[PDB]
Amino acid sequence: TLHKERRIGRLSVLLLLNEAEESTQVEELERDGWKVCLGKVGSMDAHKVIAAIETASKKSGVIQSEGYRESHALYHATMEALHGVTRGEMLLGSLLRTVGLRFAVLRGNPYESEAEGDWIAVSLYGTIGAPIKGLEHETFGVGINHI
Amino acid sequence: TLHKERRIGRLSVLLLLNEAEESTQVEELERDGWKVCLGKVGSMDAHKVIAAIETASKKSGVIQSEGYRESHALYHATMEALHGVTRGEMLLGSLLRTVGLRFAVLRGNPYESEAEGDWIAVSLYGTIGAPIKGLEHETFGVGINHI
Amino acid sequence: TLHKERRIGRLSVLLLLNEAEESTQVEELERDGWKVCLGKVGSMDAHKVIAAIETASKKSGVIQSEGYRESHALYHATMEALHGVTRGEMLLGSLLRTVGLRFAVLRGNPYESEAEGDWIAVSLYGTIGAPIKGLEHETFGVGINHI
Amino acid sequence: TLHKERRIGRLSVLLLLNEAEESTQVEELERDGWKVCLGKVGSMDAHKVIAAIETASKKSGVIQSEGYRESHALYHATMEALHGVTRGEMLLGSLLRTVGLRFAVLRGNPYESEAEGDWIAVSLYGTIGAPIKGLEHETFGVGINHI
Amino acid sequence: TLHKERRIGRLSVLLLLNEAEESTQVEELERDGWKVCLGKVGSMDAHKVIAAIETASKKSGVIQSEGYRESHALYHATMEALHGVTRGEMLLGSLLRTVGLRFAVLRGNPYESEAEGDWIAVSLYGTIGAPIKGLEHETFGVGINHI
Amino acid sequence: TLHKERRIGRLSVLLLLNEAEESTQVEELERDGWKVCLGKVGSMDAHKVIAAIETASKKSGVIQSEGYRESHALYHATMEALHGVTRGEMLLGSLLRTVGLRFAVLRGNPYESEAEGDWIAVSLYGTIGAPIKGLEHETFGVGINHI
Numbered sequence: 001t002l003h004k005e006r007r008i009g010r011l012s013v014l015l016l017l018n019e020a021e022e023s024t025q026v027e028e029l030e031r032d033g034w035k036v037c038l039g040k041v042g043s044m045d046a047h048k049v050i051a052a053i054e055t056a057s058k059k060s061g062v063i064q065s066e067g068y069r070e071s072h073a074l075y076h077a078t079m080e081a082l083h084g085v086t087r088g089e090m091l092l093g094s095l096l097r098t099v100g101l102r103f104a105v106l107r108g109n110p111y112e113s114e115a116e117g118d119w120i121a122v123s124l125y126g127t128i129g130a131p132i133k134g135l136e137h138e139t140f141g142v143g144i145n146h147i
Numbered sequence: 148t149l150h151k152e153r154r155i156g157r158l159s160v161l162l163l164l165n166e167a168e169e170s171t172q173v174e175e176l177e178r179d180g181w182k183v184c185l186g187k188v189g190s191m192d193a194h195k196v197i198a199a200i201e202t203a204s205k206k207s208g209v210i211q212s213e214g215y216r217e218s219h220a221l222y223h224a225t226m227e228a229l230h231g232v233t234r235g236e237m238l239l240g241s242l243l244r245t246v247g248l249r250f251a252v253l254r255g256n257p258y259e260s261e262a263e264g265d266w267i268a269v270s271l272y273g274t275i276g277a278p279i280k281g282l283e284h285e286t287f288g289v290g291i292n293h294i
Numbered sequence: 295t296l297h298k299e300r301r302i303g304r305l306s307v308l309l310l311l312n313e314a315e316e317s318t319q320v321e322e323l324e325r326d327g328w329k330v331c332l333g334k335v336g337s338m339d340a341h342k343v344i345a346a347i348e349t350a351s352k353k354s355g356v357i358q359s360e361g362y363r364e365s366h367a368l369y370h371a372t373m374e375a376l377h378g379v380t381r382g383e384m385l386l387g388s389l390l391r392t393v394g395l396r397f398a399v400l401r402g403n404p405y406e407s408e409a410e411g412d413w414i415a416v417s418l419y420g421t422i423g424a425p426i427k428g429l430e431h432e433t434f435g436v437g438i439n440h441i
Numbered sequence: 442t443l444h445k446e447r448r449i450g451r452l453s454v455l456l457l458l459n460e461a462e463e464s465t466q467v468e469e470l471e472r473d474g475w476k477v478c479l480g481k482v483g484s485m486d487a488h489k490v491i492a493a494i495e496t497a498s499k500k501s502g503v504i505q506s507e508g509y510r511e512s513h514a515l516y517h518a519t520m521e522a523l524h525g526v527t528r529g530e531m532l533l534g535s536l537l538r539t540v541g542l543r544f545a546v547l548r549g550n551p552y553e554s555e556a557e558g559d560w561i562a563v564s565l566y567g568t569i570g571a572p573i574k575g576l577e578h579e580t581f582g583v584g585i586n587h588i
Numbered sequence: 589t590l591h592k593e594r595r596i597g598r599l600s601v602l603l604l605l606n607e608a609e610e611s612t613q614v615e616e617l618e619r620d621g622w623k624v625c626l627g628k629v630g631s632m633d634a635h636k637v638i639a640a641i642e643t644a645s646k647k648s649g650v651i652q653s654e655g656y657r658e659s660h661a662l663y664h665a666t667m668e669a670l671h672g673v674t675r676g677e678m679l680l681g682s683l684l685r686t687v688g689l690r691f692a693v694l695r696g697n698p699y700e701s702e703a704e705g706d707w708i709a710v711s712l713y714g715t716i717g718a719p720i721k722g723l724e725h726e727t728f729g730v731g732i733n734h735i
Numbered sequence: 736t737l738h739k740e741r742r743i744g745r746l747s748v749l750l751l752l753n754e755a756e757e758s759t760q761v762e763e764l765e766r767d768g769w770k771v772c773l774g775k776v777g778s779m780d781a782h783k784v785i786a787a788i789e790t791a792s793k794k795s796g797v798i799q800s801e802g803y804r805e806s807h808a809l810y811h812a813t814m815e816a817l818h819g820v821t822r823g824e825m826l827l828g829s830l831l832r833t834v835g836l837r838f839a840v841l842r843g844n845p846y847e848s849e850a851e852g853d854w855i856a857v858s859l860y861g862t863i864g865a866p867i868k869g870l871e872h873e874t875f876g877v878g879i880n881h882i
């Protein structure tokens with residue numbers, strides 16, 4: 001049962017979508033026990049988006065730098081988030097398209113039972129379009145995985 | 148070029164994610180020229196989710212009841228939104244999973260140039276999990292298409 | 295190297311597309327050594343579409359009714375043909391859509407060298423759209439496999 | 442209701458498959474109201490196949506050069522056409538395959554009602570095989586979208 | 589670093605493929621620390637293949653009956669295994685195919701470092717073919733996830 | 736009906752998995768009438784993996800070096816084998832992942848009736864994970880096709 005106050009998904013998206021506050025929201029979330037990570041990445045290569053998220057997550061401490069387990073949970077949540085952005089073929093430049101994304105990564109227990117342990121959420125928002133500015137529209141993606 | 152104040156995607160998601168206001172947000176959006184449609188649908192059949200969205204959209208007037216063109220634009224934006232929720236296989240009950248979604252549909256020009264005309268956005272938020280309550284997590288989806 | 299006069303794909307289509315009152319193509323192809331099949335199927339169940347094509351291909355003697363080897367060559371040709379039709383998710387009714395198809399099944403060698411042996415093409419044409427007539431547009435798919 | 446005499450999909454294919462008439466078929470279709478485009482593309486990069494189809498469409502006046510709306514309709518139609526050719530994975534060279542394609546793009550109204558507006562059809566035809574001539578076979582793809 | 593002697597994937601397959609020993613291989617693996625599960629499932633519904641694997645896993649104590657965390661790890665591992673069997677579209681009956689599968693589920697740590705924790709491997713083996721015995725062939729699938 | 740002693744899939748695996756110091760399987764299979772191939776490949780480019788398998792299958796004489804027909808049977812077997820490995824997106828390096836594979840290619844008839852003719856299996860095994868060693872887990876894939 002998802003805790004009405006700890007919906008890791010909804011929270012990561014609100015953070016990702018609210019431009020006024022930035023450090024005001026991150027602190028509250030962190031004081032609530034959430035490990036937060038924010039970043040931006042524009043590219044026509046998906047592996048750079050994945051790389052960017054993984055690097056920012058490990059630096060901000062959202063996931064462990066050592067070992068595979070946690071990098072593996074993050075990898076798949078990212079894959080699942082890229083689905084919402086790619087909608088069909090997890091390809092960017094190879095299908096003549098590029099993205100400009102903002103991303104958030106949240107870690108913590110979104111459930112009532114403390115036995116559930118930690119979960120992670122990768123949220124993406126920005127644009128996807130042709131190699132030219134202006135010729136694009138919005139795109140969203142959210143992936144949730146257990147750690 | 149997307150108008151900083153008319154980002155149809157971001158707006159539909161905020162509406163979808165804000166529980167306090169409900170009719171307070173819809174009115175402002177509608178006074179701004181946006182045609183809005185809200186609804187909920189829980190099911191293990193994707194064709195009922197699609198049906199629910201299409202029916203609510205035509206009743207609330209977001210898209211034209213007559214003709215194919217507009218129903219065709221809505222159909223594909225829905226498909227693109229379901230990708231974010233299904234992340235891989237656009238299947239629910241057949242893969243032993245069910246969803247509980249909240250959906251918003253917005254229509255209007257999100258660009259600076261008035262020549263772009265109308266666009267539509269289908270946003271989904273809720274849960275996806277096993278046929279039992281509690282065993283699920285969050286899921287998001289957003290589709291954007293021109294009309 | 296393909297035989298400019300035996301491009302099994304191109305031929306199966308020209309045959310599927312033509313709506314001439316006088317039956318002149320089937321006999322011409324057969325006389326040139328080709329096996330030909332023709333059928334129509336409308337359904338919101340992909341398995342029924344695969345079923346019909348198999349059956350008509352066996353009744354017409356395009357593939358052997360005995361064994362698996364040829365039924366296997368056709369099944370994949372059919373599948374690769376349904377991709378052009380479903381474009382992404384090999385689902386019809388569960389995605390609230392339905393088809394009205396016409397199909398051709400051509401079997402024979404399309405190469406200059408007799409060594410390449412027989413090959414088989416499955417072509418599809420019709421409409422795909424909502425459950426209501428009129429609300430739809432065209433759909434095309436060609437699957438080519440070896441036998 | 443598709444107009445028996447304006448089946449944009451069927452027409453673009455017949456236009457693509459027939460070698461005898463080249464300007465004779467374009468003219469007749471142009472005089473019938475259709476915007477028409479024809480091209481050839483050989484590549485192992487999907488983005489080049491996409492870019493040529495867009496560039497040819499914008500140079501022949503099948504879709505506007507200015508704005509995003511029309512480029513967006515064509516992009517998706519191309520994607521839907523790319524499906525029938527790739528059959529499963531929208532990759533060519535990365536999967537050790539290359540294509541030699543002939544394409545067509547048709548823009549006009551295929552319905553009885555004028556309220557349906559214009560639609561665009563992207564059609565593809567040619568060979569898909571290994572990076573060696575002769576080692577291949579035929580491949581089709583038809584995409585259809587509303588503008 | 590995978591531990592040469594604890595390659596959970598390789599083990600579950602060898603365990604799945606060998607008919608001579610049944611309890612002799614389960615015991616040895618159990619005495620080596622591995623949680624093990626074995627089952628058989630014949631169906632044309634993917635959800636039944638999934639449900640049997642989950643039910644068998646929860647009854648044999650390979651994953652907890654309480655909570656979501658472990659069911660979530662197993663669900664995804666099963667999906668990843670379902671991939672190798674469906675090869676492209678996660679559908680069976682809807683695509684006129686049915687399977688007769690033997691499965692295995694292994695839970696334990698395959699790495700040198702104990703900080704990697706437990707991982708779960710779902711393995712599938714059997715036939716996938718038409719709804720008629722004999723008309724089919726072999727099919728494999730191995731899914732691997734972290735708990 | 737498959738021959739309990741000639742299940743080409745099951746055999747190709749047992750052969751791929753075994754790491755015995757004494758070469759005893761290859762010769763036994765060959766003596767029973769099977770064509771066998773063995774190779775290893777590590778790369779973050781799927782085309783290089785397909786390349787190697789083709790080549791080793793031609794050098795070993797598992798499929799004819801001349802023609803297309805057999806190269807076509809193998810290419811698809813390979814593809815259907817890569818699905819078990821990529822589980823969703825037939826991408827390695829562009830999704831920031833890489834493989835370390837071992838592959839077997841068995842060719843021969845696996846059915847009781849000699850009428851089914853020859854068939855070919857492509858089996859894969861190794862690891863898939865980040866560009867850094869250790870950060871990975873196992874991966875499996877079996878593709879079976881007719882020839």
Ligand SMILES: N[C@@H](Cc1c[nH]c[nH+]1)C(=O)O
Nearest residue numbers: 096097128129130135516
């Ligand atoms: N609209 C495309 C992106 C794009 C390519 N060209 C123009 N726009 C998408 O859905 O990703």
Ligand SMILES: N[C@@H](Cc1c[nH]c[nH+]1)C(=O)O
Nearest residue numbers: 243244275276277282663
């Ligand atoms: N977690 C699954 C849903 C589910 C099935 N069983 C339990 N949960 C998903 O990503 O859709």
Ligand SMILES: N[C@@H](Cc1c[nH]c[nH+]1)C(=O)O
Nearest residue numbers: 222390391422423424429
């Ligand atoms: N146009 C959709 C089908 C559809 C459903 N409703 C209307 N049309 C397709 O491309 O398959």
Ligand SMILES: N[C@@H](Cc1c[nH]c[nH+]1)C(=O)O
Nearest residue numbers: 537538569570571807810
């Ligand atoms: N014919 C393959 C392509 C190929 C590459 N090499 C041989 N064939 C296809 O379906 O795309």
Ligand SMILES: N[C@@H](Cc1c[nH]c[nH+]1)C(=O)O
Nearest residue numbers: 366369684685716717718
């Ligand atoms: N062998 C097919 C299934 C099938 C159905 N009928 C014949 N064959 C597959 O790859 O799934």
Ligand SMILES: N[C@@H](Cc1c[nH]c[nH+]1)C(=O)O
Nearest residue numbers: 075831832863864865870
């Ligand atoms: N584990 C991923 C690959 C990966 C990338 N980084 C770490 N692992 C897979 O299933 O392919």
Ligand SMILES: [Ba+2]
Nearest residue numbers: 088089090823
């Ligand atoms: Ba996909």
Ligand SMILES: [Ba+2]
Nearest residue numbers: 235236237382
């Ligand atoms: Ba898919």
Ligand SMILES: [Ba+2]
Nearest residue numbers: 382383529676
């Ligand atoms: Ba697919």
Ligand SMILES: [Ba+2]
Nearest residue numbers: 438439578807
């Ligand atoms: Ba092929």
Ligand SMILES: [Ba+2]
Nearest residue numbers: 137291513517
């Ligand atoms: Ba788009």
Ligand SMILES: [Ba+2]
Nearest residue numbers: 088382529530
């Ligand atoms: Ba796909």
Ligand SMILES: [Ba+2]
Nearest residue numbers: 219223431585
């Ligand atoms: Ba459509």
Ligand SMILES: [Ba+2]
Nearest residue numbers: 144284660664
């Ligand atoms: Ba999940």
Ligand SMILES: [Ba+2]
Nearest residue numbers: 235676677823
């Ligand atoms: Ba798929």
Ligand SMILES: [Ba+2]
Nearest residue numbers: 072076732872
């Ligand atoms: Ba993994």
